[PDB]
Each structure stands twice: as structure tokens, then as C-alpha cells.
Design a protein around this ligand. Sequence first.
Ligand code: CLA
Ligand code: CLA
Ligand code: CLA
Ligand code: CLA
Ligand SMILES: C=Cc1c(C)c2cc3nc(c4c5[nH]c(cc6nc(cc1[nH]2)C(C)=C6CC)c(C)c5C(=O)[C@@H]4C(=O)OC)[C@@H](CCC(=O)OC/C=C(\C)CCC[C@H](C)CCC[C@H](C)CCCC(C)C)[C@@H]3C
Ligand SMILES: CCCCCCCCCCCCCCCC(=O)OC[C@H](COP(=O)(O)OC[C@@H](O)CO)OC(=O)CCCCCCCCCCCCCCC
Ligand SMILES: CC1=C(/C=C/C(C)=C/C=C/C(C)=C/C=C/C=C(C)/C=C/C=C(C)/C=C/C2=C(C)CCCC2(C)C)C(C)(C)CCC1
Ligand SMILES: CC1=C(/C=C/C(C)=C/C=C/C(C)=C/C=C/C=C(C)/C=C/C=C(C)/C=C/C2=C(C)CCCC2(C)C)C(C)(C)CCC1
Lengths: 65, 31, 145, 482, 45, 31, 38, 351, 73, 35
Amino acid sequence: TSSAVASSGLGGQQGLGVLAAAFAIVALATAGVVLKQGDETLAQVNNAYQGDSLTVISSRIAESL
Amino acid sequence: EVNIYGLTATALFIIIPTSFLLILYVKTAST
Amino acid sequence: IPDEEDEDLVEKAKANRRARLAQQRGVTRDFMASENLTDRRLEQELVPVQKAVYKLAKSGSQLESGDLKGAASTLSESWVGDFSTVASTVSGSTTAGKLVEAIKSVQAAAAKGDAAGSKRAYVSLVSDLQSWADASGLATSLKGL
Amino acid sequence: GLPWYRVHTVVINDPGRLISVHLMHTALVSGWAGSMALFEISVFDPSDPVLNPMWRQGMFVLPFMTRLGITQSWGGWTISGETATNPGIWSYEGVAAAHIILSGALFLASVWHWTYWDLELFRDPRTGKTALDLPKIFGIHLFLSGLLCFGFGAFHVTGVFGPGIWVSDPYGLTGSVQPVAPSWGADGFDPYNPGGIASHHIAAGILGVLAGLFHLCVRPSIRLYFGLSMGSIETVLSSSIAAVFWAAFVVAGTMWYGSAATPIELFGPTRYQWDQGFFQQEIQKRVQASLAEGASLSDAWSRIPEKLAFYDYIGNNPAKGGLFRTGAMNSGDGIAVGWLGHASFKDQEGRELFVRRMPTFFETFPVLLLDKDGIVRADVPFRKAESKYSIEQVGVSVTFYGGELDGLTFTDPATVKKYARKAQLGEIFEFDRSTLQSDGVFRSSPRGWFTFGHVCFALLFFFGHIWHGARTIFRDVFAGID
Amino acid sequence: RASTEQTTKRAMLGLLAGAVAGALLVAPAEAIRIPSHEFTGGMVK
Amino acid sequence: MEALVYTFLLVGTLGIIFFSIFFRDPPRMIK
Amino acid sequence: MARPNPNKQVVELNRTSLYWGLLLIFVLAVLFSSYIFN
Amino acid sequence: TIAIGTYQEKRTWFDDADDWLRQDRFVFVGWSGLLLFPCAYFALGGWLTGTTFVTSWYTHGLATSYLEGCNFLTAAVSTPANSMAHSLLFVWGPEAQGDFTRWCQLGGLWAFVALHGAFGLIGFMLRQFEIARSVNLRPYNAIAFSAPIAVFVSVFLIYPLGQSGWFFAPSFGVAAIFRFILFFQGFHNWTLNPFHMMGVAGVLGAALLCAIHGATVENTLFEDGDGANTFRAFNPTQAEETYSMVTANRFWSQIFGVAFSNKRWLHFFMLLVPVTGLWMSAIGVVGLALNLRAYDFVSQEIRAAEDPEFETFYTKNILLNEGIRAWMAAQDQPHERLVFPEEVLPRGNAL
Amino acid sequence: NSDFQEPGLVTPLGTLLRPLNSEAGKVLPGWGTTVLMAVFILLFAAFLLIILEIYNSSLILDDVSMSWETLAK
Amino acid sequence: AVTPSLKNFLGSLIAGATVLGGIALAITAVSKFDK
Ligand code: CLA
Ligand code: CLA
Ligand code: CLA
Ligand code: CLA
Ligand SMILES: C=Cc1c(C)c2cc3nc(c4c5[nH]c(cc6nc(cc1[nH]2)C(C)=C6CC)c(C)c5C(=O)[C@@H]4C(=O)OC)[C@@H](CCC(=O)OC/C=C(\C)CCC[C@H](C)CCC[C@H](C)CCCC(C)C)[C@@H]3C
Ligand SMILES: CCCCCCCCCCCCCCCC(=O)OC[C@H](COP(=O)(O)OC[C@@H](O)CO)OC(=O)CCCCCCCCCCCCCCC
Ligand SMILES: CC1=C(/C=C/C(C)=C/C=C/C(C)=C/C=C/C=C(C)/C=C/C=C(C)/C=C/C2=C(C)CCCC2(C)C)C(C)(C)CCC1
Ligand SMILES: CC1=C(/C=C/C(C)=C/C=C/C(C)=C/C=C/C=C(C)/C=C/C=C(C)/C=C/C2=C(C)CCCC2(C)C)C(C)(C)CCC1
């Protein structure tokens, strides 16, 4: 009966809980990896276009006075 | 005093094994 | 075995090693650009400064005319902090402090009356920023994207 | 009365004492890691990251921390040569202190498990005698190892939660710690592709889990149980020795030949880059491209970064070294301080001469200035030997392009001879030799020492595997029983 | 140019080689094998 | 300093040889 | 402090083993000292 | 409970195969045979073919074959060219492209022989284990053979793997091995390595032990035969040993100073000395594979450079190594394309 | 001795983990699942050969370049 | 694409499988004949 109890315990716990935890972790991680590889590959910051003026001319505007 | 680290290495290599062996021999000889 | 030689200009090379290290950044960047590779190491910490310099240049251009008081509004739209932290990374708590002091001072001067004092502070800030860029060795990369 | 070499076998039966012993070994290794981290941080000189990198200062565990994302330090400096303002909890000192604390905690746990050796957990319900269910223990441990491997591959290297790993350009000029998106195609199996790492640590990871599950739920066959003697703890020792043996060769080979896990910017260049003229070819291609674009030779040679030229120097070759030439590379030929420049040799006729570079084998190599056709045109006699082609006679002159000696020229035979002897080693460089009292003999980089140590350990562990497998299969004969 | 210059010595040497080889291969094998029968013929394993 | 170390090591080896020759444990196990 | 461990033997080292060990260490030192000192 | 013993189940194909393999015939095949007999066979075959027909003209620029006019001492199976750095040189690989003639010309026969020989060594060690298990004996022969297999693995696989390619591995020949030895002397100063010193001590001490043990056993024999020849006065089924341990112990204790008093310890010492020596040699050659050679004695070099009037035998050995390297590199390494003029070749009269 | 010299110490973690170390020695009849092990060993050997030949340049694929130059993507 | 080297490697796998199968069939046939 020692092995009977061991078999019941393993078939329950190491047959359900381990599978559930492994599947949950694997699904979470793989979903995150796929989402971040297919959606966000480069960092985007700032916006707007600007090339009209450069600092040199603006500095040259206010040294006479 | 040339190659202080070399002298230290040689001294330790001669002392630690020698002390270990002598301690073991004394410990067993009491039997 | 190789002999001593090496004369005595080793002191000359060792004394001004920081300047050569700073200047080598531009050479490395040009090498990468010609090789058609991506630095992906210094360009990331440089885009925030690039945007900062563009925004400051526009602030100056639209403040010199004195046609808009919003200079102060756009001056501190959560971009000065990024420039300050990256500058401290490059230099650290000594030049970055001066740059943040100058930028806050010019912002205050513009917000007060946009008087001649604000323009003088802006000119001093531009000169200091140019000198800092020259010293840091990035001067060849800031301008013209 | 056990002999001195059969002493530890007193722990071969009781699992509690075995656990205590293993905890002590783990504590010792972790403490060593922390202590070396602290020692190298104390000895490290971070001022110059271009001509005085980690691999030139003899650092060993610092590159292994940097390869996974540790860059800053509490001293204010960074491995990049910049300055850090908010180092955070995870710095070199923080990692070392963490390892030391773990060593102490493991020591306390070891003494506890040594004191309370007799636990009901180690006695099976039937026959009430000490026993370990090795297949199920292996299943649990494999499940955990696969889970950790998958976590590392999908959360640390890929950067979704972690910092990433160290990726660099082919020539090791600009590298840093970045996320590594997995690569699944056939390009994920060449080890110079960092992506192949991440993908691996996912795939294998998952399999581990599955394998673990199997080994938890399926018992070994009786034929396999008796064939491999799965009831004894010595067969597992033999197999584990074989596994670490195999891993030791694999890692030594990857370190020696190079991989995406051993960047040249942390461990230094490999000898196969010097043998095949990797950096030399790149420098020449860039100079020729600049010349074709149209520019002065001095200008063309002044656009090559000092780092690339430094890689093109035989002193950085891990092959050039000695078994008892102890210490860092800086202590062999001095601390590099600057790049003199590219030396071009021209005879009186006008045709350019090129110095024959020293092959890796030769401890000392004669200097031969030869033209573009491979014909020897000048050299230095062995030692006060009768000369027919000599620097004095042929009258070669050396002109320097780029570097500190940019545009200068020399004609006196003594300086041309000295620079010709310096040139066979590769790119000329300038060395401060009075700081570390460097003797003048080349030392080996961390690559060489790592490879040597791990291959030696691999051979010794092959012998250990043989011995322990023999003592497993022949257990009855060794014990003199039925 | 390389080519054998001897015509009929091949057969004369081959006959002797075969005749000698037969005996020289059967005899030592016999000498070594008889003890092998003796050892594996009642006291083995 | 190196000469003294070498001489000490050689003298130690000679002394060990002498002690093994003359102060050995008696071989009554088989005799 | 739970129960004396039955698996408690003692290491024993006869004189010949001591001489062998001392000779080994001293001879290795003789061989490697010149290399260590360079 | 449902207990079980050993071999209480139905028979299987594995049982029949095992029974056939482990029979009692002239040659014990065993399972290891399936790995040993083919591989080793080919190895030998390869070498013989290699030493009889193929040439190393296109690999080393040499002529090493009986068909080209070479002795038994000069014939060899030369290593491939340095261009094929570490290619395993499969017949179907990108180099040979499936052409057997070009495969032989490229030097792939050396790789064939080396790999098949390594696996033959593995099979032989497994065979020793299997025989010992079959006759219920401790497999110390397996360790004694772990020594030479370690030496072979080091020299023939780890050294070339750490170098630029197979070209610098030993070539299977007498003069080839002599070239290998002189190359190590010239380029690595292998004689000055502490590990070759340990190996030399081990090997010479093993020879000394063999000779002394044989002489002592043959000269302390017990008189158990009337005839003047002592070889027939012995049968394998004896009870007592055939030599007097007491007399030998006293003799070697009065002549030398120390003597053995235990057969097991004596024979284990005989086993131990060569194995340790060869393992140390293997470690040394592993070190050499990365050019981590014992060459410098930096203090001596500095002192010699400072004043020319200081010459020790070490300096003379260094000069001899310089000569060896300079005069050998021209032809021993054709891929370098080295042309040393007579002016720059090292010479004694130029000192 | 009686029950291997009286029962051992009992701890909450010991009782929690006892099931994982109770069925020691249990085996399946016959060869069990050794054939699957052989199949997986053969597949693993093929995989190791593939990677070794890719890393030895004895197996050139289109996608892989097998040199430092692949670090520039 | 299937490069020629890949085709040769696959052929090598096939040939080695054939050799192992030949050894297995030899031992099987002889063992069955003798038992
Ligand atoms: C495989 C592991 C490994 C590797 C690859 C390295 C590699 C390195 N270490 Mg580290 N180290 C290690 C383990 C390792 N170490 C351990 C376990 C310790 C703790 C003791 C240290 C402590 C340590 C310090 C304190 C220092 C280094 C330094 C170095 C560098 C210089 C080369 C060297 O070690 O000296 C050359 C190696 C040798 C001379 C050893 C020769 C090996 C032979 C085979 C041993 C033979 C022993 C012989 C039987 C007995 C001789 C007796 C004789 C002494 C009388 C190099 C980067 C130095 C450095 O530059 O760092 C900044 C330095 O200062 N290491
Ligand atoms: C996973 C690794 C591992 C483990 C757990 C063991 C465990 C064991 N071995 Mg095995 N062994 C190993 C690796 C390992 N060995 C390797 C790699 C080799 C090849 C050299 C051997 C060769 C070997 C032999 C030949 C024998 C054993 C024996 C033993 C048992 C007694 C330990 C002993 O020698 O007394 C304790 C030994 C000492 C106190 C002496 C230590 C002095 C050493 C030589 C120098 C100092 C080492 C240094 C401080 C640390 C080096 C670190 C390095 C490993 C990185 C024990 C079960 C013995 C046994 O039971 O068989 C009957 C035995 O005869 N082992
Ligand atoms: C047991 C005996 C044995 C052993 C150990 C070896 C071992 C070796 N031989 Mg030798 N050889 C042998 C017998 C043997 N051979 C015989 C009998 C012959 C005569 C026919 C030869 C003729 C021969 C030649 C002519 C050559 C070798 C070579 C080699 C080497 C390359 C091995 C290789 O890639 O093969 C292939 C290895 C395998 C196929 C491993 C088995 C993997 C199986 C098939 C997996 C199957 C699972 C699955 C279906 C695969 C899925 C993937 C895909 C199909 C989808 C290696 C050292 C070569 C070499 O390196 O020389 C330098 C070489 O040129 N051998
Ligand atoms: C007193 C002089 C002396 C002595 C005693 C030695 C002793 C030794 N030297 Mg040498 N050496 C010396 C001077 C000396 N050296 C000098 C002055 C030089 C110049 C530098 C060298 C250069 C040198 C080199 C370059 C090498 C040695 C090596 C060795 C070791 C050889 C181990 C061995 O058996 O390998 C030979 C045995 C094998 C390779 C094992 C393979 C055996 C296979 C399985 C048998 C194959 C079956 C075969 C077909 C059956 C046919 C049998 C038939 C022949 C009857 C040994 C310790 C070698 C060594 O061990 O390094 C690790 C080595 O590589 N030495
Ligand atoms: C010159 C050195 C040397 C040689 C040639 C040698 C040879 C041999 N020793 C054997 C055994 C041993 N040797 C032992 C200890 C030692 N052996 C040593 C040194 C040697 N031992 C040393 C120094 C030790 C002390 C540790 C032990 C303990 C054993 C044994 O148990 C064993 C035995 O039973 O001896 C009677 C035999 C192994 C048979 C074999 O290869 O299996 C079959 C495998 C084969 C044939 C594959 C080898 C293929 C090789 C690698 C390819 C090259 C073959 C060409 C012919 C090379 C020619 C090279 C030219 C230079 C001539 C063989 C007769
Ligand atoms: C099934 C094999 C039956 C035996 C074949 C004859 C064996 C004797 C060969 C003597 C050399 C003659 C040239 C043959 C070589 C040859 O002509 O190959 C040619 C063949 C096809 O190449 P192709 O000529 O089609 O290539 C032409 C171009 O497309 C190349 O780019 O390559 C293969 O497919 C592999 C053949 C392996 C043949 C060797 C069999 C042994 C394999 C290794 C066994 C390992 C066992 C490991 C067990 C663990
Ligand atoms: C308790 C504790 C603590 C502390 C602790 C500590 C602090 C520790 C330390 C520790 C340590 C500090 C450790 C160390 C260790 C070391 C080692 C373990 C070493 C080893 C070595 C070796 C092993 C070597 C080897 C060798 C050599 C010598 C060289 C080469 C060769 C050979 C390899 C042989 C505290 C209070 C905080 C809290 C609570 C816990
Ligand atoms: C082709 C090939 C192969 C195979 C091969 C083989 C397997 C071979 C074998 C071979 C063999 C198996 C050979 C043998 C040989 C032998 C010889 C060559 C012998 C010689 C002898 C002698 C020379 C002697 C002498 C003498 C004597 C002893 C007597 C008298 C005296 C004298 C001294 C005269 C294969 C396809 C796989 C792959 C590829 C390659």
C-alpha cells in the first residue's frame, strides 16, 4: 500500500499541478515573446519635424547688442 | 626580496601539505 | 624580447589621453556610417540629445523675435530631464549641473519678460553647449542629424 | 582506518551529510566568485576603455558579469568609460556582495543539514532503510533546470523583462548590452549569431520541462534499471562527470574559436583573426575605399579608429604567451598609451616595401621588407653578420600616416631598423612600461587561460569518469562480495 | 616514365609467396589456438 | 635569495631520503 | 545533536605514506621553483 | 507486493545477440567488437594504403610512398594542407566533393586514419572492460590504457585543434614523427617543459621498475626442480609464490636502503608510474596546443641581453632553437611562402 | 537494527516531500520504453552532427554565413 | 535551398544508417541461426 499511496499522490499532484504550472508559465512567456517580437522591435520617442533653423544663425542674431 | 608572490607560493606549497601530512601521521600514531 | 626604446613622449601621449578618447568617437561613428552598419550603442543615447538640441534651437529662433511667450512652455516638456541624465552619463554631475542651471536660468528669464537678459543668457547657454559638445567629442554628430 | 583518498566516501550512504557537503562546496564556489569580483574591482583601472580594456588587465570574472548586463559600478565609473549616476542595486560590487551573502547562508544551511542528518524523508516506507529514488529526483531536477533555462531564454536574453546580453559589431568597435530577438530559421545555428542563443534557451527549455514530466511519470525498465545500476549513487556520478566533461570541451572550443557568447571586446581577439588578417584586411579595405573616394593618404589613414588598429597587433594574440608568464597582458609589454600610426617603408628607388608579419608560431622572426611581388628587398642581418641587403645599404625610409606621428618621416638607419622590428608585430603602438615594471615578454589573454584550464579539467574528468564507471560496473568485485 | 621491366618473375615469385604463406599462416595459428581450446574447454568464465 | 631557496629544497629532499632510509617503520609485515 | 552517525571512520596514514607525501611535495617544489621564480 | 529477481522475463532479440557475441571462440567479439574490429581494421588498412600508393606532393611538397621510392622509415601518411584548416575531410565533403582520387591527394587519408583509430582505441578500452566483467576481475588494465589514449587524444587531436589546422598534427610515419619531435624542440622548447620532464621521469622509472622486478624475481627463485633450468620447475596451479619475497626485500634494503614488502603495492606502483607520467605529458601538450610554452626564464634573458659576457646552457639552447626554427621554416611550412636570404639566416659565427 | 536504528526525525517539509522519495526501486516489466530512448538518441546524434558540421564548415547552408561578419545583420 | 553539401550530408546519414542496419542484420541472422 505504500506504493498505492505514492501512486495516488503522484498521479494527482505531479500529474495535474505540474502540468498546469508548466503550461501557464510557457504560454505566458511565449505569448509575451511573440507579442514583443511582432509588435515592438525599435524604440520610438519624440515626434514632429524640424529643420528650418539651426543654432548657428540664431546665435549670430543676438551678439551685436 | 625578489618575487614576493613566488616566495609566498613556494612557502605555502611546502607548508600546507607538510603540515597536513604531519598532522594526519600524529593523529593516526596515537592509535 | 622587445627592448625598451619608446623615448619619452609616452608622457605626452598619456597626459592628454582623455582628449584623444573624446575625439575618437567621431572617427568611430564615421567608420560605422561608411561601413553601412548600425552602432546601436552610442546612437541610442544620442537621439535624446539630438531632439534636445533641435528643440532648443527652435526655442531660440522663435524667442529672438519675441513673438511668442510659449518658449518657457515648450522648454520644460519633460525633455530637459532626459538631456540632463544623458549628459551626466557622458560627463557626470559637473558639466550636467552647469547645463541644467543654464537652461533653467534662460527659461526663467524668458518667462519673466523676454528681455535682453534672457537673450544674453540664451547666447551664453548656446556657447556653453557648443563648448561641451566639442569637449565630449560628439560635436561632429549633433548637427545635421 | 580509511586511506586519505577514500575519506569522503563516509558520505556515500546518508543523504543528509551528502547534502551538507554539497552545500559547503556551493558556498565555497560562490564565495570565490564574490572574492574575485571584489579583487578585480579593486585592481581594475577604468580610465581608458579603448587601449586598456578588461582583457588587457587580466580580468577574469568581470567579462562574465558584463556579458549578461552588469555595466555600472558604485565607484561612479562604467565599463564604457562613461560615468554612472544611479548604479542601482545590481552593480559589480552588489553582485559580489550578493554572492558572499549567499555563500554564508549556504554555509549555515550546510552546518544545519550536517547536524540533523537523520531525517524521515530519506527512509522509504517499505524496508525502512535509507534510499534515494534517483529517477524521480532526476525528473524533478530536470524539470526545474528546463524551467530556469526557458526563463533565461525568454525573459533575460530576449529583453522582455531582463536587460539582454552583450552584442557587438563584427570588428568589436562598438558593443553593448541589448535585447536579442530570437532567430528560428537556419541562421540560428551559426554561433556568431546572438539570436541563436535566445531561441535555444527557449526550445531546449521547453523540452526540458516535457522531459522532466516524462521522468516524473514513467519508471525505468527493469533491464535498464539493472544494466546501468540505477539503484547506486555512483552511476549518476559517472554520468554527471561525463556530462561536465563534454560541456568543458564545448565551452573551451567556443572560447578559443569565438562565438556570440565570447565577444572579442570582453575576452579579446582570437588567434585565427591574426592568422587570417581579419582586422588587417578590414583596415586595408577602408583605406583603399577612402583613397578611391579621393583623399590624402594621411587623411585616409587618420579615419581608422585606434581600437581597430589595436586589434591588429600580435601582442593581443592569445597564442603569444607563456605557461609561467604570469599576470595581465599589461605586465608583459606595458600599458598602451597611443597609436603611432601606419608605417610605410620606401626604398631609394621609390617602390613601397611591406614588412613580413610575424607568424604565431615564431617566438622570434627575422625582419624582411619585401615589395608587392613577394620578393625580399631589405632586412637586418642576424647579428653583426655580413650584409648584402641591409637598411643602411638599400637606404629604406619610414613614413608615418595617422596616429601621433602623423606626417613625420625618418631616414637614419637606426630608427628605420627599430620601427621595422616594431612593425613585424603588426600595427605600431606606444607603451608605458615604467608603471607596472613590465619585463617585455608577451602574456596570454583571458581566452588562453580559460581554454587551457578547462581543457585540462576536461581530460582529468575523463579519467574520473572512467574510474567511477569502472567502480560502478564492478561494484561486487571491488567489494569482494556476491 | 615508370613501368615494370620484368616479365615472368611475377609468377615465379607468386608461386613461392603462396606456398610459403599457406604454411606460415596455418602453423603459428595452430600453436596459439590449441591452448585456447585447452583454456576455454572446461574452465572458463 | 633564489639560491637559498633552491639549497633549502635540495637539503630537505636529502633529509627526507635519509630519514626514509634509516628511520623507516620496521618491515615485520612479511619477513 | 540528533543522533551519533554510524558512518564515522578515521583517516589513517602510516609512516611510508608520510614519507611518500613529503618526498612528492618537496620534489615538485624543486621542479617548479625555478619556473615560479622565473 | 510483487517482487522480482534478475532475468525472470521472456527472452528478446537482445538476449540472442548478446549470447552470440559473448561466446568462447579464438577471438572474443563482444559488443565492443562492433566498434573496434571495423574501425581499427580500416585504420591499419588506411595507413598501409597511405604508405604504399598515395603521395603528399600537393599537401607538403614531399614524396612519401613506396610507389615514389621511399623506405619504411621515410614513408608516411602526411597531414592535409593548412588551407583545409580543421575540415574533417569527409569523402563527400565540400573539399573532396566525392572524388576519391582528389580526396587522397588533398590528404583526407590522414583524417580517415586518425578518426577511425580514435574510435578503435575507444572500442579497445570498452573491450578490456567487457573482458574484465566477463571474467570477474577488476579492470585496472582499462586505466593503464586510459593513459595512452589520453596521450593520443592530446597529441593527435587537441594540439592541431588549438593550432591553425591539421597540418601541424603528427604525420603517421617514422621520419614524420622525428620531424614532429624536432619541430617541438625548435618552436616550443618542449624539453624545458616541466610536464615532459615528469613524463620522462615516469617512463624511465617504469623501465627501471620492469628491469629490477624481473631480475629480482628471476634471482630469488625457490629451488623446486632438479634440472639446471628453472623455467620447467613451475606450473600455473602452484600454491605458494615462486620467489622469496623475504630475500628480495632484505637484498634491496641492504643495497639501496628501501625495499618493497607488499606484492600488491609493488605491482600497483608499477602500474602507477607510467600512467602518471603519460598523463602529465598529455597535460603539457594540451598547454602547448595554445602556445602556452615554458620558454622564457625572463631573468636569464634579461641578464644575457644586458652583458654579452654571460652564457649558460639555457642561452645556448635558445640559440639552437633559433637556428632550428630559421632553417626549418622554409620547407616545413610551405604555406607561409618564406624566402630567408642567407644574410638573415642565424649562424654561430655571427654571434 | 530495528527500522534502521529507530525512526528518523520528522519535520513538516519532510512529510510534505515524503511522497517524492517513497517509491524507490519501482520498475516496469520488460524493456519498457527503451526503443523511444534509442530513437531520441539517434535524433540527437544527427542534430549534434548537423551543428558540428555547420560550425566546422563541412556543411554550408545558404542562410548561415559562419564568420564574424554575421554579427552585422 | 538544398545546397550540394547538405545533399551529401544527408546521403552520408543514409549510408551510415545502412551500415548500422547491415551490422544489426548480420548479428540477428547469425544469432538466430545458432540459437
Ligand atoms: C581556470 C580558472 C582560472 C583562470 C582561467 C584564471 C585566469 C587568470 N587569473 Mg585567476 N584565479 C583562479 C582561477 C582562474 N584564474 C582561482 C581559483 C583563484 C583563487 C586562488 C584565482 C586568483 C587569481 C588572482 C589573485 C589573480 C589571478 C590572475 C589571473 C590572470 C593571470 C594568469 C594566471 O592565473 O596566472 C598564471 C597561471 C599559472 C602560473 C598557473 C600555472 C598552472 C600549473 C599547471 C599549475 C601547476 C602547480 C604545481 C603542481 C605546483 C607548483 C608548486 C610551486 C608553486 C612551488 C588570468 C586572467 C591575476 C590577474 O592578472 O588578475 C588581475 C591575479 O592577480 N587569479
Ligand atoms: C563531481 C566530481 C567528483 C566527485 C563528487 C568525486 C567523489 C569521489 N571520488 Mg572521484 N574523481 C573526480 C571527480 C569527482 N570525485 C575526478 C575529476 C577525478 C580524476 C582525477 C577523480 C578520481 C578519483 C579517484 C582516482 C578516486 C576518487 C574517489 C572518490 C571518492 C573519495 C574522494 C577522495 O578522493 O578522497 C578525498 C581526497 C582528498 C582529501 C585529497 C585532495 C587533494 C587533491 C588531490 C589536491 C587538492 C585539490 C584542490 C584543493 C581543489 C581542486 C579543485 C578542482 C577540482 C577545480 C568520492 C566518492 C576515490 C574512491 O572512493 O575510490 C576508491 C578514488 O580512489 N575519485
Ligand atoms: C562502427 C564502425 C564505424 C565507425 C564508428 C565509423 C566512424 C566514422 N567513419 Mg567509417 N566506415 C565504416 C564503419 C565505421 N565508421 C565502414 C564499415 C565503412 C565502409 C563502408 C566506412 C567507410 C568510411 C569512409 C569512406 C569515411 C568514413 C568516415 C567516418 C567518420 C565520419 C562519420 C560520419 O559522418 O558518418 C555518418 C554518421 C552517422 C550517419 C551517424 C548515425 C545517425 C543516424 C543515421 C541518425 C538517423 C536518424 C534520422 C533518420 C535522421 C534524421 C535527419 C534527416 C534524415 C531528416 C567517423 C570517424 C569518413 C571520415 O570522416 O573520414 C575522414 C569517411 O570519409 N568511414
Ligand atoms: C630521455 C629521453 C626521452 C624520454 C624518455 C621521453 C619520453 C616521452 N616523450 Mg619525449 N622528447 C624528448 C626526450 C624524451 N622523451 C626530447 C629531447 C624531445 C624534443 C623536444 C622530445 C619530444 C617529445 C614530443 C614532441 C612528444 C614526446 C612524448 C613523450 C612521451 C611519450 C608517450 C608515448 O608512449 O607516446 C606514444 C604512445 C601513444 C601515442 C599511444 C598510442 C598507442 C596506440 C594505441 C597503439 C596503436 C596500435 C599499433 C598499430 C600496434 C603496433 C605495435 C607495434 C609497434 C609493435 C614520453 C613521456 C609525447 C607525449 O606523450 O606527449 C603527450 C610527445 O608528443 N616527447
Ligand atoms: C610507442 C608507443 C606505444 C605503442 C606503439 C603501444 C602499442 C600497444 N599497446 C597496447 C596495449 C597497451 N599499452 C599500455 C600501456 C602503455 N603503452 C605505451 C606505449 C605504447 N603502446 C606506454 C608508454 C604505456 C604506459 C601507460 C597498456 C596498459 C596496454 C594494453 O592493455 C594494450 C595491450 O593489450 O597490449 C598488449 C596495444 C594496443 C592495441 C591497439 O591499438 O588496439 C587496437 C586499436 C587499434 C589498432 C587502433 C589504432 C590505430 C592508430 C591510432 C592509427 C595509426 C596506426 C599506424 C600503424 C601508425 C603507424 C605510425 C608510424 C610512426 C609507425 C598495442 C600493442
Ligand atoms: C551505402 C554505402 C555502401 C558502401 C559504399 C562503398 C563504400 C566504400 C567507399 C570507398 C570510397 C569510394 C568513394 C565513395 C564516396 C562517394 O562516392 O560519395 C558520393 C556521394 C554522392 O556525391 P555526388 O558525387 O552526387 O556529389 C557530386 C556533387 O554534387 C558534389 O557537390 O556522397 C554520398 O552520398 C555519401 C556516400 C558515402 C559512402 C561511404 C559509406 C560510408 C559512410 C560512413 C559510415 C558511417 C557509419 C557510422 C556508424 C555509427
Ligand atoms: C557567514 C555569513 C557571513 C559572511 C560570510 C563570508 C564573508 C564568507 C566569505 C567566504 C570566502 C571569502 C570564501 C572564499 C573561498 C575561496 C576558495 C574556495 C578558493 C579556492 C581556490 C582554489 C580551489 C584554487 C585552486 C587552484 C589554484 C590555487 C590555482 C590554479 C590551480 C588550482 C585550480 C588547483 C555574514 C557575516 C555576512 C552573514 C551571515 C553569513
Ligand atoms: C582502400 C580504402 C579502404 C580500405 C582499405 C583497407 C581495409 C586496406 C587494408 C590493407 C591491408 C590489410 C594491407 C596489408 C598490407 C601488408 C603488408 C604491406 C605487409 C608487409 C610485410 C612485410 C613487408 C614483411 C617483411 C618481412 C617479414 C616480416 C618476413 C621476412 C622478413 C621481412 C622483414 C622482409 C576503404 C574503402 C575502407 C576507405 C578508403 C581507403
